[PDB]
Every structure is written in C-alpha cells, then in structure tokens.
PDB file of N, CA, C and O in Angstrom:
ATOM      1  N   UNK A   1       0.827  -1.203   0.000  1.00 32.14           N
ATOM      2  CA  UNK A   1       0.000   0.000   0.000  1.00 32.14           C
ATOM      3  C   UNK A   1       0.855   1.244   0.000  1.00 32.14           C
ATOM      4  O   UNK A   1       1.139   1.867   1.023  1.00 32.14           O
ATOM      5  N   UNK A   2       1.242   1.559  -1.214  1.00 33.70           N
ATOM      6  CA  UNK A   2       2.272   2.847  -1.513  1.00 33.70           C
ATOM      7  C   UNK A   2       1.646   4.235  -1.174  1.00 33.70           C
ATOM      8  O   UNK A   2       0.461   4.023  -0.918  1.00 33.70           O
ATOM      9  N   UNK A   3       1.833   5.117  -1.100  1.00 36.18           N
ATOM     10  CA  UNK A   3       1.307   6.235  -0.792  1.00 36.18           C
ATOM     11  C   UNK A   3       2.004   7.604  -1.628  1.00 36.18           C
ATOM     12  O   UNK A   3       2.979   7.482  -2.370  1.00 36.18           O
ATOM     13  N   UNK A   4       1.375   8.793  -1.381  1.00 33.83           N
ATOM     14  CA  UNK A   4       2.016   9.792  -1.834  1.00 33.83           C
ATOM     15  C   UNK A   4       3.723  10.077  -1.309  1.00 33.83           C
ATOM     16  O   UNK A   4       4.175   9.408  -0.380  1.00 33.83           O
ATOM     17  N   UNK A   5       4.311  10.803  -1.797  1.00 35.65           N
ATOM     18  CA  UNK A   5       5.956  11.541  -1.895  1.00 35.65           C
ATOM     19  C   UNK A   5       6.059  10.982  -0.075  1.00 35.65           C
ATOM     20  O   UNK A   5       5.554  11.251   1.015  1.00 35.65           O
ATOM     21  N   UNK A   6       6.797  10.305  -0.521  1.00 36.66           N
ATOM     22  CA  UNK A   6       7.700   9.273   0.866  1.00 36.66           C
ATOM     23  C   UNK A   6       6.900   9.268   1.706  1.00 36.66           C
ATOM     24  O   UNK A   6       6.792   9.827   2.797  1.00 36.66           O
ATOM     25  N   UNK A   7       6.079   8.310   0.902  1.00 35.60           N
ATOM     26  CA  UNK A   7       4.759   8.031   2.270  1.00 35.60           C
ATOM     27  C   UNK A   7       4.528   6.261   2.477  1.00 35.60           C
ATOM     28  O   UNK A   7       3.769   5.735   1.663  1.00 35.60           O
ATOM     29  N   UNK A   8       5.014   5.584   3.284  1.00 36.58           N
ATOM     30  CA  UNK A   8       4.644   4.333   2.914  1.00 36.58           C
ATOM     31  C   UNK A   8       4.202   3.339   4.049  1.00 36.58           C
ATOM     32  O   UNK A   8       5.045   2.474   4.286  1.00 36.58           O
ATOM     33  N   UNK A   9       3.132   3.288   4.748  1.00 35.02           N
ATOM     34  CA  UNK A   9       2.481   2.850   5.943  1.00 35.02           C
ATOM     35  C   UNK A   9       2.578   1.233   5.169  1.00 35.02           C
ATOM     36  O   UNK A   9       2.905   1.150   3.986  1.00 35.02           O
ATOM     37  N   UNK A  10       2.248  -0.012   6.008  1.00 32.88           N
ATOM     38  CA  UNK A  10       2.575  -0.947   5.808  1.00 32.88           C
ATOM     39  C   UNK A  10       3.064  -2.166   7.246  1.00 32.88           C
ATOM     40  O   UNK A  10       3.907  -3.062   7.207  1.00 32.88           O
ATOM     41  N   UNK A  11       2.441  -1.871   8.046  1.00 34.53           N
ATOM     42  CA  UNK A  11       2.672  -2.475   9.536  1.00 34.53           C
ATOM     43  C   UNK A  11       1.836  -2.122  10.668  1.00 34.53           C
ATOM     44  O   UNK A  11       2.395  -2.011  11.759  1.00 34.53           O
ATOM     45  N   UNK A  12       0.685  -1.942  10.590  1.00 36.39           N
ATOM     46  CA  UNK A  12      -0.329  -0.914  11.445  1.00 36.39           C
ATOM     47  C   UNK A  12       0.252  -0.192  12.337  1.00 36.39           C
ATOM     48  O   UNK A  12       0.483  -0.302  13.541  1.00 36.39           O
ATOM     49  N   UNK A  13       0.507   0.812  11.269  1.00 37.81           N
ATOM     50  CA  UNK A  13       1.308   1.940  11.931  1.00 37.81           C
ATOM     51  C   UNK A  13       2.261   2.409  10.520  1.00 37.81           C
ATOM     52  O   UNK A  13       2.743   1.457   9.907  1.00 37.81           O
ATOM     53  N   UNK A  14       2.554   3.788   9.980  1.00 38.85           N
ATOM     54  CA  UNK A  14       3.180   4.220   9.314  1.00 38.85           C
ATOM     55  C   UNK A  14       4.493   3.871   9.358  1.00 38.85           C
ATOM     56  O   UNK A  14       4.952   3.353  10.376  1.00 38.85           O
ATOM     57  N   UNK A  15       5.433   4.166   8.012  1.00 42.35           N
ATOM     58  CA  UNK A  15       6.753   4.550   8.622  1.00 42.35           C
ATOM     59  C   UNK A  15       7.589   5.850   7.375  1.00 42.35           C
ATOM     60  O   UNK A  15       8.656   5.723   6.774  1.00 42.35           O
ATOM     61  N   UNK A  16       6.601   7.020   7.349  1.00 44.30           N
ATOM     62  CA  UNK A  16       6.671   7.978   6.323  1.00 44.30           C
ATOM     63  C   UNK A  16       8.040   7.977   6.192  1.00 44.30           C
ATOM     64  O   UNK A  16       8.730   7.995   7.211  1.00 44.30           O
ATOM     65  N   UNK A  17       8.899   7.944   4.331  1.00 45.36           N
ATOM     66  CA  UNK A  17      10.579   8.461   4.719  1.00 45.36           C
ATOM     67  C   UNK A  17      10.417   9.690   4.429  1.00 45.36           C
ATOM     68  O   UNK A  17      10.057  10.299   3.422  1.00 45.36           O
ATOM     69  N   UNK A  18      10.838  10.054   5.793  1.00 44.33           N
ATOM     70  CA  UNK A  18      10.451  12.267   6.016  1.00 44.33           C
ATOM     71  C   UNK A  18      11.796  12.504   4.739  1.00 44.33           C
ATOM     72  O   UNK A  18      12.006  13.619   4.261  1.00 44.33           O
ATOM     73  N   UNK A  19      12.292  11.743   4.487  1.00 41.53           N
ATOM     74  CA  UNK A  19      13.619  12.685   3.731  1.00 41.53           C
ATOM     75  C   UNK A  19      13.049  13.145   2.139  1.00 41.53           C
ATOM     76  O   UNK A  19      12.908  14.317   1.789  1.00 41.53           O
ATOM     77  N   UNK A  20      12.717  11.752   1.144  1.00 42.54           N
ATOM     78  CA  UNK A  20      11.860  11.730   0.176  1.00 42.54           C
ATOM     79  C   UNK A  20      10.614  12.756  -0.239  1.00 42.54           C
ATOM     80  O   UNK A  20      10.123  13.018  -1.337  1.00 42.54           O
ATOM     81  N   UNK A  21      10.184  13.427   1.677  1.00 41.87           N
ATOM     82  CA  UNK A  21       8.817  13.992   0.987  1.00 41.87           C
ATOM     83  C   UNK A  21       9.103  15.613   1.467  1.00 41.87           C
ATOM     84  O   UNK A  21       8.519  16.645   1.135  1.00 41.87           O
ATOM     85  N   UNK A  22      10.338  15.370   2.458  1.00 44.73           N
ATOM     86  CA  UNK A  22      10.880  16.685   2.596  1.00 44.73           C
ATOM     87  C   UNK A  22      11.192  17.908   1.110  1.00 44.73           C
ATOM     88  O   UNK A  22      10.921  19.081   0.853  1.00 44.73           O
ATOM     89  N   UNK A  23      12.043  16.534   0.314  1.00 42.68           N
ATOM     90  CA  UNK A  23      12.617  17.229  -1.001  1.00 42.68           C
ATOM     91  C   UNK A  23      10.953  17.358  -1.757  1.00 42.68           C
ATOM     92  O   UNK A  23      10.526  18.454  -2.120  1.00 42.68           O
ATOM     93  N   UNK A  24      10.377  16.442  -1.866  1.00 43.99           N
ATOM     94  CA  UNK A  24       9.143  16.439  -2.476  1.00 43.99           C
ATOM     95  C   UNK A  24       8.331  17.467  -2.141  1.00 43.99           C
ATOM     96  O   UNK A  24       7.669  17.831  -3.113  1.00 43.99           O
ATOM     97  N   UNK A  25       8.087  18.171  -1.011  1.00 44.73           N
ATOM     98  CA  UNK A  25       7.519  19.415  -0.463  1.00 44.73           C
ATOM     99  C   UNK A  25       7.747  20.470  -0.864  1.00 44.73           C
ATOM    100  O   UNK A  25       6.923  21.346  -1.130  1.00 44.73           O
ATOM    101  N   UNK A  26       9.542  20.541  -1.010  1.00 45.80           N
ATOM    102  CA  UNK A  26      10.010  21.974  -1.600  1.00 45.80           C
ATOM    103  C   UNK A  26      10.129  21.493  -2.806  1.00 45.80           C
ATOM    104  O   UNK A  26       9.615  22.456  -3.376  1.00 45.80           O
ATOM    105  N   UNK A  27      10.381  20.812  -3.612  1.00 45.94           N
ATOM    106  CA  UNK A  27      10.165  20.202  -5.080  1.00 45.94           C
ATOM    107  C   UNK A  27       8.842  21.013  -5.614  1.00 45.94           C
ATOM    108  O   UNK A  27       8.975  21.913  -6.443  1.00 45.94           O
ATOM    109  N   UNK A  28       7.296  20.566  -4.985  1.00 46.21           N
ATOM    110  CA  UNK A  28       6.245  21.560  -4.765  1.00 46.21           C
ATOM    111  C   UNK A  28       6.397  22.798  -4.969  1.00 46.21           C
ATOM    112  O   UNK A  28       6.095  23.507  -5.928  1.00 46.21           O
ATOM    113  N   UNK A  29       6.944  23.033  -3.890  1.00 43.89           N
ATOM    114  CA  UNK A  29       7.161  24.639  -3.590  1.00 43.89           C
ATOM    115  C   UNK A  29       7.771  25.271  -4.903  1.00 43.89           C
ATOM    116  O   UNK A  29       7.473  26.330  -5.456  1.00 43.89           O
ATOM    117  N   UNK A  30       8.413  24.620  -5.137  1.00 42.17           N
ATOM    118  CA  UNK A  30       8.877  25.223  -6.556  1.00 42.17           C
ATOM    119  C   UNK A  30       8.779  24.522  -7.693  1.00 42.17           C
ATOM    120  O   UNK A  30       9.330  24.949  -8.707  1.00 42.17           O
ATOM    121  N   UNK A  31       8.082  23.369  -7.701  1.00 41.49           N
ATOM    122  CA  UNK A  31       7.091  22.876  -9.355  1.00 41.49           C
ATOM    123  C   UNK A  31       7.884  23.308 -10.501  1.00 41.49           C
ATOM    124  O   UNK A  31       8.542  22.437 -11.070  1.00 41.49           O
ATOM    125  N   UNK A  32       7.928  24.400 -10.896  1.00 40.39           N
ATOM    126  CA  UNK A  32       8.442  24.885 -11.774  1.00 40.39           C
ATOM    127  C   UNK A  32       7.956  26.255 -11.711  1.00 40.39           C
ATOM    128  O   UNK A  32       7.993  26.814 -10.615  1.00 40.39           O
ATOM    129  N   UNK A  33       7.398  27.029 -12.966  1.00 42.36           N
ATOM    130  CA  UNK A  33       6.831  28.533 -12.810  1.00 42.36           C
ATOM    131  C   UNK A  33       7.488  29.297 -13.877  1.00 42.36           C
ATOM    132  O   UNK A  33       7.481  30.521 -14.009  1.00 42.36           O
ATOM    133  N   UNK A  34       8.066  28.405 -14.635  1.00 41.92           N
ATOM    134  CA  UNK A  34       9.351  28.459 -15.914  1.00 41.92           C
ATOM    135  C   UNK A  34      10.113  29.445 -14.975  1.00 41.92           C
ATOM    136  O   UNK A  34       9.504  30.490 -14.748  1.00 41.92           O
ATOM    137  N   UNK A  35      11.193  29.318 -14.456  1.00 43.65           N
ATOM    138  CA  UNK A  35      11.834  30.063 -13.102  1.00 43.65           C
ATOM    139  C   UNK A  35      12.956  28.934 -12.845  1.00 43.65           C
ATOM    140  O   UNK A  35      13.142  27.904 -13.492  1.00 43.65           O
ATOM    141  N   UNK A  36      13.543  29.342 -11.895  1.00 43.85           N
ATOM    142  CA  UNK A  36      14.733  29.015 -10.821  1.00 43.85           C
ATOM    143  C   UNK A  36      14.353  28.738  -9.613  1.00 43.85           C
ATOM    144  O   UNK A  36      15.247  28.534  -8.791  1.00 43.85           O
ATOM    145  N   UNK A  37      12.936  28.655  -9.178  1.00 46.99           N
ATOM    146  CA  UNK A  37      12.599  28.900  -7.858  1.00 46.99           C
ATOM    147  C   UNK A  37      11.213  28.977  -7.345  1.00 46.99           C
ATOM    148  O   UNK A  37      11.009  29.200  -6.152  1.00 46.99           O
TER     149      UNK A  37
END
C-alpha cells in the first residue's frame, strides 16, 4: 500500500521516509513557474 511523496504505511502503523517527501515538499514549492525557484 504505496502512498504519496515518501509516504509508505505498511505495519499498522506508518513509517513515512520524512527525507523523500521533505525534497518532495520543496520540489512543490517550486514545481516549476518556468523560473529558478
């Protein structure tokens, strides 16, 4: 049961990898915007 940007529960009980969704958050944050930033 995969989940969104470093999300992967699987043991009743999560075990999110914060690192994967950290970059994935600011990845977000800056999507693109045809930009640098």
């Amino acid at each position: 049961k995969y989940y969104g940007n470093g999300v992967h529960c699987t043991k009743s009980g999560c075990s999110v990898n914060w690192g994967e969704a950290f970059s994935a958050g600011v990845h977000r944050l800056a999507n693109g915007g045809n930009g640098f930033w």
